[PDB]
Amino acid sequence: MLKPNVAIIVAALKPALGIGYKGKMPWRLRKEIRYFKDVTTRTTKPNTRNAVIMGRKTWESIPQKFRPLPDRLNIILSRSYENEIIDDNIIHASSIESSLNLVSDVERVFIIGGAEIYNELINNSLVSHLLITEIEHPSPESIEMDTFLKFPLESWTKQPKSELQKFVGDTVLEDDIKEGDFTYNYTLWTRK
Ligand SMILES: NC(=O)C1=CN([C@@H]2O[C@H](COP(=O)(O)OP(=O)(O)OC[C@H]3O[C@@H](n4cnc5c(N)ncnc54)[C@H](OP(=O)(O)O)[C@@H]3O)[C@@H](O)[C@H]2O)C=CC1
Ligand SMILES: COc1cc(C(C)(C)C#Cc2c(C)nc(N)nc2N)cc(OC)c1OC
């Protein structure tokens, strides 16, 4: 796969864009999790799949029984990994481009975490889309948070809902979804 168009997918708490605390997620938003599954899994052309790419720490955060994430090609990046195809669902590499050089029959490519990987790849020109779940809370400062996005969104344009709807197909997009004290919306951004 040569020069794939790549999408970042992430859920972040406004306005600071916090995404984690002590190696874990600061919320459990069940509908958001299902959205993540549906969007990363679904394909538009028959007999293909998507790839999901992540840093080693993010991979290790998934319970070992629930990785690899089913129905998607999982790619894990470490600075200690040489290129290795582990099995049909798992690749080890040290860059996204090299990891996908090894790959055919993949439609979409998603970056699924974590902060370090996000904050590098936001400035990689292969990344053409951001799928950001913007989470809001009445008192965001009260949520324990130590990992943050550093996204220069001035160089990006938030697209209308119609563009997001097109991207996700017939996936149902509900507005202002509320779980506990959190309220969230699905968004799509492209390069300005
Ligand atoms: N809210 C959300 O939507 C999401 C939040 N998260 C959160 O993010 C946090 C994890 O993020 P973070 O701790 O930054 O870790 P990452 O998941 O981003 O992994 C970092 C590791 O990836 C490898 N790596 C980083 N850059 C490169 C590179 N350029 N080339 C090759 N390998 C590289 C290194 O592995 P090595 O050390 O082996 O060399 C590094 O230690 C957790 O708290 C998690 O819950 C994660 C996903 C989504
Ligand atoms: C697939 O579910 C998980 C996803 C994840 C990761 C970190 C890969 C994620 C994510 C993610 C979500 C939930 N939403 C959005 N919008 N983007 C993401 N990258 C970690 C998990 O355990 C900690 C999970 O439970 C098994």
Side-chain angles (χ1 to χ4, degrees), residues 36 49-54 59 62 66-77 84-93 99-100 103 106 110 112:
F36 168 78
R49 63 180 170 167
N50 301 322
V52 293
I53 307 181
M54 75 205 91
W59 169 261
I62 307 156
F66 295 105
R67 66 202 204 217
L69 303 180
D71 312 313
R72 289 145 286 181
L73 173 59
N74 290 228
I75 298 173
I76 309 97
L77 305 178
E84 197 167 38
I85 300 150
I86 302 296
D87 60 30
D88 195 53
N89 292 316
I90 299 174
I91 292 175
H92 282 184
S99 79
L100 294 155
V103 173
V106 160
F110 297 95
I112 74 171

PDB file of all heavy atoms in Angstrom, residues 36 49-54 59 62 66-77 84-93 99-100 103 106 110 112:
ATOM      1  N   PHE A  36     -16.604   3.921  17.670  1.00  0.00           N
ATOM      2  CA  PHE A  36     -15.223   3.589  17.326  1.00  0.00           C
ATOM      3  C   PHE A  36     -15.136   2.235  16.615  1.00  0.00           C
ATOM      4  O   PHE A  36     -14.466   2.103  15.595  1.00  0.00           O
ATOM      5  CB  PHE A  36     -14.343   3.596  18.578  1.00  0.00           C
ATOM      6  CG  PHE A  36     -12.988   3.001  18.364  1.00  0.00           C
ATOM      7  CD1 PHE A  36     -11.985   3.732  17.717  1.00  0.00           C
ATOM      8  CD2 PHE A  36     -12.701   1.709  18.812  1.00  0.00           C
ATOM      9  CE1 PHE A  36     -10.719   3.186  17.520  1.00  0.00           C
ATOM     10  CE2 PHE A  36     -11.445   1.151  18.616  1.00  0.00           C
ATOM     11  CZ  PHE A  36     -10.444   1.894  17.961  1.00  0.00           C
ATOM     12  N   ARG A  49     -10.686  -4.976   4.188  1.00  0.00           N
ATOM     13  CA  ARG A  49     -10.743  -4.601   5.598  1.00  0.00           C
ATOM     14  C   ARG A  49      -9.991  -3.289   5.831  1.00  0.00           C
ATOM     15  O   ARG A  49      -9.281  -2.802   4.953  1.00  0.00           O
ATOM     16  CB  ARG A  49     -10.149  -5.710   6.473  1.00  0.00           C
ATOM     17  CG  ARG A  49      -8.687  -5.980   6.207  1.00  0.00           C
ATOM     18  CD  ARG A  49      -8.149  -7.081   7.108  1.00  0.00           C
ATOM     19  NE  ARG A  49      -6.819  -7.500   6.687  1.00  0.00           N
ATOM     20  CZ  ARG A  49      -6.003  -8.254   7.417  1.00  0.00           C
ATOM     21  NH1 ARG A  49      -6.375  -8.673   8.617  1.00  0.00           N
ATOM     22  NH2 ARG A  49      -4.812  -8.587   6.943  1.00  0.00           N
ATOM     23  N   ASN A  50     -10.173  -2.708   7.009  1.00  0.00           N
ATOM     24  CA  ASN A  50      -9.394  -1.541   7.407  1.00  0.00           C
ATOM     25  C   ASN A  50      -8.215  -1.916   8.301  1.00  0.00           C
ATOM     26  O   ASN A  50      -8.208  -2.978   8.920  1.00  0.00           O
ATOM     27  CB  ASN A  50     -10.284  -0.524   8.110  1.00  0.00           C
ATOM     28  CG  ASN A  50     -11.431  -0.051   7.237  1.00  0.00           C
ATOM     29  OD1 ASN A  50     -11.273   0.136   6.033  1.00  0.00           O
ATOM     30  ND2 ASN A  50     -12.592   0.138   7.842  1.00  0.00           N
ATOM     31  N   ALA A  51      -7.223  -1.033   8.353  1.00  0.00           N
ATOM     32  CA  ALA A  51      -6.119  -1.157   9.301  1.00  0.00           C
ATOM     33  C   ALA A  51      -6.267  -0.159  10.449  1.00  0.00           C
ATOM     34  O   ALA A  51      -6.717   0.979  10.250  1.00  0.00           O
ATOM     35  CB  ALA A  51      -4.782  -0.956   8.593  1.00  0.00           C
ATOM     36  N   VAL A  52      -5.911  -0.601  11.649  1.00  0.00           N
ATOM     37  CA  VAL A  52      -5.807   0.290  12.789  1.00  0.00           C
ATOM     38  C   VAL A  52      -4.373   0.294  13.313  1.00  0.00           C
ATOM     39  O   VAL A  52      -3.787  -0.769  13.563  1.00  0.00           O
ATOM     40  CB  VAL A  52      -6.830  -0.060  13.907  1.00  0.00           C
ATOM     41  CG1 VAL A  52      -8.253   0.205  13.418  1.00  0.00           C
ATOM     42  CG2 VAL A  52      -6.693  -1.516  14.350  1.00  0.00           C
ATOM     43  N   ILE A  53      -3.812   1.492  13.449  1.00  0.00           N
ATOM     44  CA  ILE A  53      -2.414   1.660  13.833  1.00  0.00           C
ATOM     45  C   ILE A  53      -2.323   2.341  15.201  1.00  0.00           C
ATOM     46  O   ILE A  53      -3.048   3.293  15.475  1.00  0.00           O
ATOM     47  CB  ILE A  53      -1.639   2.494  12.774  1.00  0.00           C
ATOM     48  CG1 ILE A  53      -1.825   1.887  11.365  1.00  0.00           C
ATOM     49  CG2 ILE A  53      -0.156   2.601  13.152  1.00  0.00           C
ATOM     50  CD1 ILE A  53      -1.071   2.648  10.243  1.00  0.00           C
ATOM     51  N   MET A  54      -1.439   1.839  16.061  1.00  0.00           N
ATOM     52  CA  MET A  54      -1.328   2.363  17.416  1.00  0.00           C
ATOM     53  C   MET A  54       0.083   2.224  17.973  1.00  0.00           C
ATOM     54  O   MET A  54       0.850   1.376  17.535  1.00  0.00           O
ATOM     55  CB  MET A  54      -2.328   1.658  18.342  1.00  0.00           C
ATOM     56  CG  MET A  54      -1.916   0.233  18.725  1.00  0.00           C
ATOM     57  SD  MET A  54      -3.334  -0.784  19.155  1.00  0.00           S
ATOM     58  CE  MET A  54      -3.747  -1.486  17.560  1.00  0.00           C
ATOM     59  N   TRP A  59      -1.587  -0.374  22.629  1.00  0.00           N
ATOM     60  CA  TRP A  59      -1.806  -1.806  22.415  1.00  0.00           C
ATOM     61  C   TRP A  59      -1.823  -2.567  23.744  1.00  0.00           C
ATOM     62  O   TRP A  59      -2.739  -3.347  24.008  1.00  0.00           O
ATOM     63  CB  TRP A  59      -0.732  -2.371  21.483  1.00  0.00           C
ATOM     64  CG  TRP A  59      -0.700  -3.880  21.393  1.00  0.00           C
ATOM     65  CD1 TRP A  59       0.143  -4.722  22.062  1.00  0.00           C
ATOM     66  CD2 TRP A  59      -1.500  -4.711  20.536  1.00  0.00           C
ATOM     67  NE1 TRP A  59      -0.100  -6.027  21.696  1.00  0.00           N
ATOM     68  CE2 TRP A  59      -1.099  -6.051  20.761  1.00  0.00           C
ATOM     69  CE3 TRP A  59      -2.522  -4.455  19.608  1.00  0.00           C
ATOM     70  CZ2 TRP A  59      -1.680  -7.134  20.087  1.00  0.00           C
ATOM     71  CZ3 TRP A  59      -3.105  -5.532  18.941  1.00  0.00           C
ATOM     72  CH2 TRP A  59      -2.679  -6.857  19.186  1.00  0.00           C
ATOM     73  N   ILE A  62      -5.038  -2.420  25.942  1.00  0.00           N
ATOM     74  CA  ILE A  62      -6.163  -3.302  25.601  1.00  0.00           C
ATOM     75  C   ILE A  62      -5.961  -4.643  26.317  1.00  0.00           C
ATOM     76  O   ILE A  62      -4.880  -5.230  26.230  1.00  0.00           O
ATOM     77  CB  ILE A  62      -6.252  -3.550  24.072  1.00  0.00           C
ATOM     78  CG1 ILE A  62      -6.279  -2.221  23.305  1.00  0.00           C
ATOM     79  CG2 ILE A  62      -7.483  -4.403  23.723  1.00  0.00           C
ATOM     80  CD1 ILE A  62      -5.799  -2.332  21.859  1.00  0.00           C
ATOM     81  N   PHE A  66      -8.684  -9.306  24.402  1.00  0.00           N
ATOM     82  CA  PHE A  66      -9.522  -8.513  23.501  1.00  0.00           C
ATOM     83  C   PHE A  66      -8.711  -7.810  22.414  1.00  0.00           C
ATOM     84  O   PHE A  66      -9.229  -6.956  21.684  1.00  0.00           O
ATOM     85  CB  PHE A  66     -10.370  -7.522  24.301  1.00  0.00           C
ATOM     86  CG  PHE A  66     -11.381  -8.187  25.193  1.00  0.00           C
ATOM     87  CD1 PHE A  66     -11.178  -8.258  26.562  1.00  0.00           C
ATOM     88  CD2 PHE A  66     -12.524  -8.783  24.651  1.00  0.00           C
ATOM     89  CE1 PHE A  66     -12.109  -8.892  27.392  1.00  0.00           C
ATOM     90  CE2 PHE A  66     -13.461  -9.421  25.471  1.00  0.00           C
ATOM     91  CZ  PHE A  66     -13.248  -9.478  26.841  1.00  0.00           C
ATOM     92  N   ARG A  67      -7.444  -8.198  22.301  1.00  0.00           N
ATOM     93  CA  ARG A  67      -6.601  -7.827  21.163  1.00  0.00           C
ATOM     94  C   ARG A  67      -6.118  -9.104  20.439  1.00  0.00           C
ATOM     95  O   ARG A  67      -5.928 -10.153  21.084  1.00  0.00           O
ATOM     96  CB  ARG A  67      -5.418  -6.951  21.619  1.00  0.00           C
ATOM     97  CG  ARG A  67      -4.411  -7.655  22.525  1.00  0.00           C
ATOM     98  CD  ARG A  67      -3.603  -6.664  23.371  1.00  0.00           C
ATOM     99  NE  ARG A  67      -2.329  -7.244  23.789  1.00  0.00           N
ATOM    100  CZ  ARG A  67      -1.747  -7.044  24.971  1.00  0.00           C
ATOM    101  NH1 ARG A  67      -2.329  -6.288  25.900  1.00  0.00           N
ATOM    102  NH2 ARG A  67      -0.583  -7.618  25.229  1.00  0.00           N
ATOM    103  N   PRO A  68      -5.971  -9.038  19.099  1.00  0.00           N
ATOM    104  CA  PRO A  68      -6.157  -7.829  18.295  1.00  0.00           C
ATOM    105  C   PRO A  68      -7.625  -7.461  18.171  1.00  0.00           C
ATOM    106  O   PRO A  68      -8.502  -8.330  18.307  1.00  0.00           O
ATOM    107  CB  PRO A  68      -5.603  -8.238  16.921  1.00  0.00           C
ATOM    108  CG  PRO A  68      -5.834  -9.696  16.852  1.00  0.00           C
ATOM    109  CD  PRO A  68      -5.644 -10.210  18.257  1.00  0.00           C
ATOM    110  N   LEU A  69      -7.897  -6.178  17.940  1.00  0.00           N
ATOM    111  CA  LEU A  69      -9.265  -5.736  17.662  1.00  0.00           C
ATOM    112  C   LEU A  69      -9.787  -6.487  16.431  1.00  0.00           C
ATOM    113  O   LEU A  69      -9.168  -6.451  15.367  1.00  0.00           O
ATOM    114  CB  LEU A  69      -9.314  -4.218  17.454  1.00  0.00           C
ATOM    115  CG  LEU A  69      -8.775  -3.359  18.608  1.00  0.00           C
ATOM    116  CD1 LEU A  69      -8.880  -1.876  18.281  1.00  0.00           C
ATOM    117  CD2 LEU A  69      -9.488  -3.664  19.927  1.00  0.00           C
ATOM    118  N   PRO A  70     -10.896  -7.230  16.595  1.00  0.00           N
ATOM    119  CA  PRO A  70     -11.365  -8.141  15.540  1.00  0.00           C
ATOM    120  C   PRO A  70     -11.756  -7.423  14.249  1.00  0.00           C
ATOM    121  O   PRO A  70     -12.195  -6.277  14.290  1.00  0.00           O
ATOM    122  CB  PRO A  70     -12.608  -8.797  16.164  1.00  0.00           C
ATOM    123  CG  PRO A  70     -12.470  -8.583  17.633  1.00  0.00           C
ATOM    124  CD  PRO A  70     -11.748  -7.287  17.797  1.00  0.00           C
ATOM    125  N   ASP A  71     -11.586  -8.112  13.117  1.00  0.00           N
ATOM    126  CA  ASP A  71     -12.094  -7.661  11.803  1.00  0.00           C
ATOM    127  C   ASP A  71     -11.272  -6.523  11.180  1.00  0.00           C
ATOM    128  O   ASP A  71     -11.639  -5.992  10.137  1.00  0.00           O
ATOM    129  CB  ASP A  71     -13.583  -7.252  11.872  1.00  0.00           C
ATOM    130  CG  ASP A  71     -14.454  -8.280  12.585  1.00  0.00           C
ATOM    131  OD1 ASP A  71     -14.331  -9.481  12.286  1.00  0.00           O
ATOM    132  OD2 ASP A  71     -15.280  -7.870  13.430  1.00  0.00           O
ATOM    133  N   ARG A  72     -10.172  -6.155  11.830  1.00  0.00           N
ATOM    134  CA  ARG A  72      -9.280  -5.106  11.323  1.00  0.00           C
ATOM    135  C   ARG A  72      -7.838  -5.588  11.379  1.00  0.00           C
ATOM    136  O   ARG A  72      -7.475  -6.387  12.240  1.00  0.00           O
ATOM    137  CB  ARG A  72      -9.424  -3.825  12.163  1.00  0.00           C
ATOM    138  CG  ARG A  72     -10.739  -3.078  11.975  1.00  0.00           C
ATOM    139  CD  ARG A  72     -11.201  -2.427  13.287  1.00  0.00           C
ATOM    140  NE  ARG A  72     -11.723  -3.427  14.224  1.00  0.00           N
ATOM    141  CZ  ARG A  72     -12.207  -3.160  15.435  1.00  0.00           C
ATOM    142  NH1 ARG A  72     -12.232  -1.909  15.900  1.00  0.00           N
ATOM    143  NH2 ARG A  72     -12.664  -4.153  16.193  1.00  0.00           N
ATOM    144  N   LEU A  73      -7.014  -5.107  10.456  1.00  0.00           N
ATOM    145  CA  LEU A  73      -5.588  -5.335  10.546  1.00  0.00           C
ATOM    146  C   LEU A  73      -5.012  -4.441  11.643  1.00  0.00           C
ATOM    147  O   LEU A  73      -5.138  -3.220  11.576  1.00  0.00           O
ATOM    148  CB  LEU A  73      -4.909  -5.043   9.203  1.00  0.00           C
ATOM    149  CG  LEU A  73      -3.378  -5.084   9.167  1.00  0.00           C
ATOM    150  CD1 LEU A  73      -2.835  -6.459   9.601  1.00  0.00           C
ATOM    151  CD2 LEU A  73      -2.877  -4.727   7.784  1.00  0.00           C
ATOM    152  N   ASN A  74      -4.417  -5.058  12.666  1.00  0.00           N
ATOM    153  CA  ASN A  74      -3.808  -4.306  13.773  1.00  0.00           C
ATOM    154  C   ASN A  74      -2.319  -4.106  13.528  1.00  0.00           C
ATOM    155  O   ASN A  74      -1.596  -5.060  13.245  1.00  0.00           O
ATOM    156  CB  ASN A  74      -4.012  -5.024  15.127  1.00  0.00           C
ATOM    157  CG  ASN A  74      -5.473  -4.996  15.616  1.00  0.00           C
ATOM    158  OD1 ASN A  74      -5.744  -4.666  16.775  1.00  0.00           O
ATOM    159  ND2 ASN A  74      -6.396  -5.386  14.753  1.00  0.00           N
ATOM    160  N   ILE A  75      -1.868  -2.862  13.634  1.00  0.00           N
ATOM    161  CA  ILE A  75      -0.462  -2.528  13.442  1.00  0.00           C
ATOM    162  C   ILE A  75       0.046  -1.814  14.692  1.00  0.00           C
ATOM    163  O   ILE A  75      -0.544  -0.831  15.125  1.00  0.00           O
ATOM    164  CB  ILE A  75      -0.268  -1.628  12.186  1.00  0.00           C
ATOM    165  CG1 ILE A  75      -0.730  -2.374  10.914  1.00  0.00           C
ATOM    166  CG2 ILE A  75       1.188  -1.174  12.065  1.00  0.00           C
ATOM    167  CD1 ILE A  75      -0.747  -1.522   9.633  1.00  0.00           C
ATOM    168  N   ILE A  76       1.124  -2.332  15.282  1.00  0.00           N
ATOM    169  CA  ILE A  76       1.682  -1.752  16.503  1.00  0.00           C
ATOM    170  C   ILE A  76       3.073  -1.176  16.252  1.00  0.00           C
ATOM    171  O   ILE A  76       3.951  -1.863  15.714  1.00  0.00           O
ATOM    172  CB  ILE A  76       1.760  -2.793  17.665  1.00  0.00           C
ATOM    173  CG1 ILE A  76       0.409  -3.489  17.858  1.00  0.00           C
ATOM    174  CG2 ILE A  76       2.220  -2.125  18.964  1.00  0.00           C
ATOM    175  CD1 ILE A  76       0.301  -4.837  17.155  1.00  0.00           C
ATOM    176  N   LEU A  77       3.266   0.075  16.662  1.00  0.00           N
ATOM    177  CA  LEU A  77       4.544   0.767  16.488  1.00  0.00           C
ATOM    178  C   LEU A  77       5.346   0.803  17.787  1.00  0.00           C
ATOM    179  O   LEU A  77       4.837   1.206  18.838  1.00  0.00           O
ATOM    180  CB  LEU A  77       4.328   2.198  15.956  1.00  0.00           C
ATOM    181  CG  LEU A  77       3.514   2.372  14.662  1.00  0.00           C
ATOM    182  CD1 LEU A  77       3.363   3.848  14.320  1.00  0.00           C
ATOM    183  CD2 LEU A  77       4.127   1.617  13.490  1.00  0.00           C
ATOM    184  N   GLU A  84       7.891  -6.952  11.193  1.00  0.00           N
ATOM    185  CA  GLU A  84       7.515  -8.354  11.323  1.00  0.00           C
ATOM    186  C   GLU A  84       6.015  -8.515  11.162  1.00  0.00           C
ATOM    187  O   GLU A  84       5.242  -7.848  11.838  1.00  0.00           O
ATOM    188  CB  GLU A  84       7.949  -8.902  12.691  1.00  0.00           C
ATOM    189  CG  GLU A  84       7.977 -10.432  12.783  1.00  0.00           C
ATOM    190  CD  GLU A  84       8.707 -10.932  14.028  1.00  0.00           C
ATOM    191  OE1 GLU A  84       8.567 -10.302  15.098  1.00  0.00           O
ATOM    192  OE2 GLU A  84       9.416 -11.962  13.936  1.00  0.00           O
ATOM    193  N   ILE A  85       5.608  -9.410  10.267  1.00  0.00           N
ATOM    194  CA  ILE A  85       4.219  -9.835  10.212  1.00  0.00           C
ATOM    195  C   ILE A  85       4.049 -10.964  11.226  1.00  0.00           C
ATOM    196  O   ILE A  85       4.588 -12.059  11.040  1.00  0.00           O
ATOM    197  CB  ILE A  85       3.835 -10.336   8.800  1.00  0.00           C
ATOM    198  CG1 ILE A  85       4.024  -9.215   7.767  1.00  0.00           C
ATOM    199  CG2 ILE A  85       2.395 -10.852   8.785  1.00  0.00           C
ATOM    200  CD1 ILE A  85       4.377  -9.710   6.394  1.00  0.00           C
ATOM    201  N   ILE A  86       3.340 -10.678  12.316  1.00  0.00           N
ATOM    202  CA  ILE A  86       3.151 -11.661  13.389  1.00  0.00           C
ATOM    203  C   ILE A  86       2.163 -12.737  12.936  1.00  0.00           C
ATOM    204  O   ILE A  86       2.486 -13.927  12.916  1.00  0.00           O
ATOM    205  CB  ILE A  86       2.652 -10.999  14.691  1.00  0.00           C
ATOM    206  CG1 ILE A  86       3.633  -9.913  15.160  1.00  0.00           C
ATOM    207  CG2 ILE A  86       2.417 -12.063  15.796  1.00  0.00           C
ATOM    208  CD1 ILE A  86       5.015 -10.435  15.549  1.00  0.00           C
ATOM    209  N   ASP A  87       0.960 -12.302  12.583  1.00  0.00           N
ATOM    210  CA  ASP A  87      -0.009 -13.153  11.883  1.00  0.00           C
ATOM    211  C   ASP A  87      -0.829 -12.289  10.921  1.00  0.00           C
ATOM    212  O   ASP A  87      -0.462 -11.146  10.654  1.00  0.00           O
ATOM    213  CB  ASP A  87      -0.902 -13.911  12.879  1.00  0.00           C
ATOM    214  CG  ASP A  87      -1.712 -12.985  13.779  1.00  0.00           C
ATOM    215  OD1 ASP A  87      -2.064 -11.871  13.347  1.00  0.00           O
ATOM    216  OD2 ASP A  87      -2.030 -13.395  14.915  1.00  0.00           O
ATOM    217  N   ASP A  88      -1.936 -12.824  10.406  1.00  0.00           N
ATOM    218  CA  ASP A  88      -2.719 -12.096   9.409  1.00  0.00           C
ATOM    219  C   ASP A  88      -3.385 -10.834   9.971  1.00  0.00           C
ATOM    220  O   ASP A  88      -3.780  -9.937   9.208  1.00  0.00           O
ATOM    221  CB  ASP A  88      -3.761 -13.002   8.747  1.00  0.00           C
ATOM    222  CG  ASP A  88      -4.321 -12.399   7.472  1.00  0.00           C
ATOM    223  OD1 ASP A  88      -3.517 -12.031   6.588  1.00  0.00           O
ATOM    224  OD2 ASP A  88      -5.561 -12.271   7.366  1.00  0.00           O
ATOM    225  N   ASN A  89      -3.501 -10.763  11.298  1.00  0.00           N
ATOM    226  CA  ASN A  89      -4.164  -9.642  11.955  1.00  0.00           C
ATOM    227  C   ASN A  89      -3.226  -8.704  12.704  1.00  0.00           C
ATOM    228  O   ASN A  89      -3.670  -7.692  13.236  1.00  0.00           O
ATOM    229  CB  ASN A  89      -5.227 -10.150  12.924  1.00  0.00           C
ATOM    230  CG  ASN A  89      -6.390 -10.804  12.219  1.00  0.00           C
ATOM    231  OD1 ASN A  89      -6.888 -10.298  11.214  1.00  0.00           O
ATOM    232  ND2 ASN A  89      -6.842 -11.933  12.752  1.00  0.00           N
ATOM    233  N   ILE A  90      -1.946  -9.055  12.785  1.00  0.00           N
ATOM    234  CA  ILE A  90      -0.991  -8.275  13.605  1.00  0.00           C
ATOM    235  C   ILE A  90       0.317  -8.034  12.870  1.00  0.00           C
ATOM    236  O   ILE A  90       0.982  -8.986  12.439  1.00  0.00           O
ATOM    237  CB  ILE A  90      -0.680  -8.962  14.969  1.00  0.00           C
ATOM    238  CG1 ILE A  90      -1.949  -9.106  15.814  1.00  0.00           C
ATOM    239  CG2 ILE A  90       0.379  -8.160  15.759  1.00  0.00           C
ATOM    240  CD1 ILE A  90      -1.741  -9.904  17.110  1.00  0.00           C
ATOM    241  N   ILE A  91       0.686  -6.756  12.746  1.00  0.00           N
ATOM    242  CA  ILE A  91       1.982  -6.357  12.199  1.00  0.00           C
ATOM    243  C   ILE A  91       2.753  -5.508  13.213  1.00  0.00           C
ATOM    244  O   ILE A  91       2.172  -4.646  13.889  1.00  0.00           O
ATOM    245  CB  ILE A  91       1.814  -5.562  10.872  1.00  0.00           C
ATOM    246  CG1 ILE A  91       1.273  -6.484   9.764  1.00  0.00           C
ATOM    247  CG2 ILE A  91       3.141  -4.913  10.443  1.00  0.00           C
ATOM    248  CD1 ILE A  91       0.957  -5.771   8.464  1.00  0.00           C
ATOM    249  N   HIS A  92       4.053  -5.771  13.324  1.00  0.00           N
ATOM    250  CA  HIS A  92       4.969  -4.928  14.087  1.00  0.00           C
ATOM    251  C   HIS A  92       5.817  -4.088  13.131  1.00  0.00           C
ATOM    252  O   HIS A  92       6.293  -4.586  12.117  1.00  0.00           O
ATOM    253  CB  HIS A  92       5.878  -5.790  14.961  1.00  0.00           C
ATOM    254  CG  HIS A  92       5.218  -6.304  16.205  1.00  0.00           C
ATOM    255  ND1 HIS A  92       5.898  -7.031  17.160  1.00  0.00           N
ATOM    256  CD2 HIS A  92       3.949  -6.177  16.662  1.00  0.00           C
ATOM    257  CE1 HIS A  92       5.074  -7.329  18.150  1.00  0.00           C
ATOM    258  NE2 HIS A  92       3.884  -6.830  17.869  1.00  0.00           N
ATOM    259  N   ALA A  93       6.003  -2.816  13.467  1.00  0.00           N
ATOM    260  CA  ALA A  93       6.812  -1.908  12.644  1.00  0.00           C
ATOM    261  C   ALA A  93       7.273  -0.710  13.460  1.00  0.00           C
ATOM    262  O   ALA A  93       6.932  -0.591  14.640  1.00  0.00           O
ATOM    263  CB  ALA A  93       6.020  -1.446  11.429  1.00  0.00           C
ATOM    264  N   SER A  99       5.066  -0.002   7.641  1.00  0.00           N
ATOM    265  CA  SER A  99       4.119  -1.032   8.086  1.00  0.00           C
ATOM    266  C   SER A  99       3.100  -1.391   6.999  1.00  0.00           C
ATOM    267  O   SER A  99       2.677  -2.539   6.894  1.00  0.00           O
ATOM    268  CB  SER A  99       3.389  -0.583   9.357  1.00  0.00           C
ATOM    269  OG  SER A  99       2.340   0.329   9.056  1.00  0.00           O
ATOM    270  N   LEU A 100       2.720  -0.395   6.199  1.00  0.00           N
ATOM    271  CA  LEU A 100       1.685  -0.563   5.173  1.00  0.00           C
ATOM    272  C   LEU A 100       2.270  -0.948   3.808  1.00  0.00           C
ATOM    273  O   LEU A 100       1.549  -1.408   2.923  1.00  0.00           O
ATOM    274  CB  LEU A 100       0.834   0.705   5.061  1.00  0.00           C
ATOM    275  CG  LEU A 100      -0.022   1.054   6.288  1.00  0.00           C
ATOM    276  CD1 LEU A 100      -0.322   2.537   6.336  1.00  0.00           C
ATOM    277  CD2 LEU A 100      -1.311   0.235   6.334  1.00  0.00           C
ATOM    278  N   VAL A 103       1.359  -4.470   2.845  1.00  0.00           N
ATOM    279  CA  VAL A 103      -0.096  -4.635   2.984  1.00  0.00           C
ATOM    280  C   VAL A 103      -0.894  -4.439   1.685  1.00  0.00           C
ATOM    281  O   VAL A 103      -0.685  -3.469   0.950  1.00  0.00           O
ATOM    282  CB  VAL A 103      -0.657  -3.689   4.086  1.00  0.00           C
ATOM    283  CG1 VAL A 103      -2.165  -3.732   4.119  1.00  0.00           C
ATOM    284  CG2 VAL A 103      -0.081  -4.051   5.448  1.00  0.00           C
ATOM    285  N   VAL A 106      -6.455  -3.534   1.984  1.00  0.00           N
ATOM    286  CA  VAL A 106      -6.886  -2.655   3.066  1.00  0.00           C
ATOM    287  C   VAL A 106      -7.474  -1.390   2.471  1.00  0.00           C
ATOM    288  O   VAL A 106      -6.858  -0.760   1.604  1.00  0.00           O
ATOM    289  CB  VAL A 106      -5.712  -2.313   4.013  1.00  0.00           C
ATOM    290  CG1 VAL A 106      -6.011  -1.050   4.837  1.00  0.00           C
ATOM    291  CG2 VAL A 106      -5.418  -3.493   4.922  1.00  0.00           C
ATOM    292  N   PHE A 110      -6.686   3.835   9.997  1.00  0.00           N
ATOM    293  CA  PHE A 110      -6.967   4.676  11.162  1.00  0.00           C
ATOM    294  C   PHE A 110      -5.821   4.645  12.169  1.00  0.00           C
ATOM    295  O   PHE A 110      -5.286   3.579  12.476  1.00  0.00           O
ATOM    296  CB  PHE A 110      -8.258   4.217  11.867  1.00  0.00           C
ATOM    297  CG  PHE A 110      -9.502   4.334  11.014  1.00  0.00           C
ATOM    298  CD1 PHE A 110      -9.966   3.243  10.285  1.00  0.00           C
ATOM    299  CD2 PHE A 110     -10.225   5.529  10.969  1.00  0.00           C
ATOM    300  CE1 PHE A 110     -11.120   3.345   9.493  1.00  0.00           C
ATOM    301  CE2 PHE A 110     -11.383   5.636  10.197  1.00  0.00           C
ATOM    302  CZ  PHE A 110     -11.828   4.536   9.451  1.00  0.00           C
ATOM    303  N   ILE A 112      -5.284   4.964  15.984  1.00  0.00           N
ATOM    304  CA  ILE A 112      -6.182   4.814  17.135  1.00  0.00           C
ATOM    305  C   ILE A 112      -5.543   5.086  18.509  1.00  0.00           C
ATOM    306  O   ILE A 112      -6.178   4.869  19.545  1.00  0.00           O
ATOM    307  CB  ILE A 112      -6.921   3.447  17.119  1.00  0.00           C
ATOM    308  CG1 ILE A 112      -5.970   2.300  17.497  1.00  0.00           C
ATOM    309  CG2 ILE A 112      -7.567   3.212  15.765  1.00  0.00           C
ATOM    310  CD1 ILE A 112      -6.677   0.966  17.706  1.00  0.00           C
TER     311      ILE A 112
END
